[PDB]
Design a protein around this ligand. Structure first.
Ligand SMILES: c1ccc(SCCN2CCOCC2)cc1
Length: 460
């Protein structure tokens, strides 16, 4: 039975509005409704992994697991296995997988982050799950961010707190936050970004939605505008939105948006908005293709509609050679030439690099670089030809060309990372000097760049 080189992943996000679901929710898992929908000819084909994020979920874990498993069994005639379930207040994540994957999945982690302080601590935050699927690390975050049209900055702050403090994946990757720990990271939820248009324009917005004319609305979507200004979700991707706003509906129909201010809304307007979103970030040159992104039309218990997204995702096998794991393979090496970091810091300490990768027996620390001044004010840290030669555990190019090197640039004075990035070993050539590049981030914000050349030797 061969190991897969691709899997499909279903991501669902639904703010349930504190109401039990209706008796049938299969359209959600079938990617049917509005937007980029899944072909009817695929309806009986199970996804490999289903990741369900809820917000304002009134159900017990047991109650929701029984609904989800029975739903998928009706669709697919497969009894899915529960990989993980984690709940913070009314924010929940469930991961289900086909039974054949049970002995491909390991290192299952769960965590949560509570956002805000005092007042603003008590119902918003995130839950997450990570695990290994054979050689590939997968992370999943379901977040319920701060509500309200005039709180986009709070939402951006909630995002940074979640990516700093959510403790998922390999703890040995100590300089790296969740935005670097996974081959594939999916971040979804009721992110609560709004369409930023004047209140007086509510009926005009509704008109546009009825005409399926979303362009003048998406140009005011706060998540797209904040992302384009690099204020949030730097280096994540989202599929084009081709479904109507998923909030705020009158319950028990989808014929009406309920936008007007009420005591129950704190006298706030809720103009129609794309509150409910799926984003991803995968390591460079790994296969990931969004195959659906849309909303259901027939699940009407909540003031939100469920959102679905599905992905093809490249995976790798758990590789064994006669040498590594458990030793190095002398026929492999990774060399860095002419490398330098460009940092935005105003500080003057010496810096060194750390190289982390599951192709190495353990992480590698470089010598200190030589600091110079860039022509436009910047700090440039030069490593020249001084970086250590990296010794992979396995030299076979079918393994090594699928790997990645995480890089942290650390202060010699404090051993704190000033920037993190990732280099793919999926090169155009071996035994050939080739340019490499990564942006560097810290707490998910841009802090600099790392560039130079690589030379990769494999057994071929
Ligand atoms: C919002 C809207 C448009 C863009 S254009 C750049 C798109 N990507 C994103 C991440 O991958 C590289 C570039 C970005 C944010």
């Amino acid at each position: 039975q061969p190991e897969p080189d691709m899997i499909t992943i279903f991501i669902g996000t639904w703010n349930m509005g504190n109401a039990p679901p209706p008796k049938k929710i299969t359209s959600w898992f079938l990617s049917k409704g509005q937007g980029k929908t899944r072909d009817d000819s695929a309806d009986y084909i199970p996804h490999d992994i289903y990741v369900i994020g809820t917000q304002e979920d009134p159900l017990s874990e047991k109650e929701w697991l029984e609904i989800l498993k029975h739903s998928l069994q009706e669709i697919t005639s497969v009894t899915f296995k529960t990989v993980a379930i984690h709940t913070l207040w009314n924010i929940r994540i469930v991961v289900l997988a086909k039974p054949e994957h049970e002995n491909r999945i390991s290192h299952i982690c769960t965590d949560n982050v509570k956002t805000g302080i005092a007042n603003t601590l008590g119902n918003k935050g995130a839950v997450g799950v990570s695990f290994m699927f054979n050689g590939t690390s997968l992370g999943f975050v379901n977040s319920h961010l701060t509500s309200g049209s005039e709180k986009k900055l709070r939402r951006n702050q909630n995002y940074m707190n979640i990516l700093r403090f959510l403790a998922l994946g390999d703890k040995k990757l100590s300089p790296f936050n969740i935005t670097h720990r996974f081959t594939h990271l999916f971040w979804f939820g009721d992110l609560n970004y709004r369409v930023d248009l004047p209140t007086w324009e509510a009926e005009t917005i509704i008109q546009k939605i009825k005409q399926q004319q979303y362009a003048d609305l998406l140009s005011h979507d706060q998540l797209l505008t904040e992302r384009r200004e690099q204020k949030v979700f730097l280096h994540f991707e989202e599929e084009e939105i081709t479904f109507a706003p998923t909030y705020r509906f009158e319950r028990l129909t989808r014929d009406k948006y309920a936008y007007t201010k009420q005591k129950a809304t704190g006298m706030k307007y809720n103009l129609p908005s794309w509150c409910d979103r799926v984003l991803w970030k995968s390591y460079p040159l790994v296969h990931v293709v969004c195959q659906s992104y849309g909303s259901t039309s027939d699940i009407m218990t909540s003031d939100h509609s469920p959102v679905f997204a599905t992905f093809e995702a490249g995976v790798t096998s758990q590789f064994v050679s006669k040498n590594g794991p458990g030793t190095v393979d002398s026929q492999g090496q990774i060399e860095f030439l002419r490398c330098y970091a460009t940092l935005k810091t105003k500080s003057q300490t010496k810096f060194y690099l750390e190289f982390h990768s599951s192709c190495l027996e353990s992480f590698v620390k470089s010598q200190e670089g030589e600091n110079e001044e860039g022509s436009e004010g910047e700090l440039v840290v030069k490593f020249g030809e001084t970086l250590p030669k990296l010794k992979p555990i396995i030299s076979d190019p079918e393994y090594l060309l699928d790997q990645h090197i995480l890089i942290s640039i650390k202060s010699s004075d404090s051993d704190e990372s000033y920037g993190e990035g990732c280099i793919a070993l999926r090169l155009e050539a071996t035994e050939t000097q080739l340019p490499i590049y990564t942006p560097l981030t810290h707490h998910g914000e841009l802090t600099g760049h790392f560039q130079g050349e690589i030379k990769l030797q494999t057994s071929q």
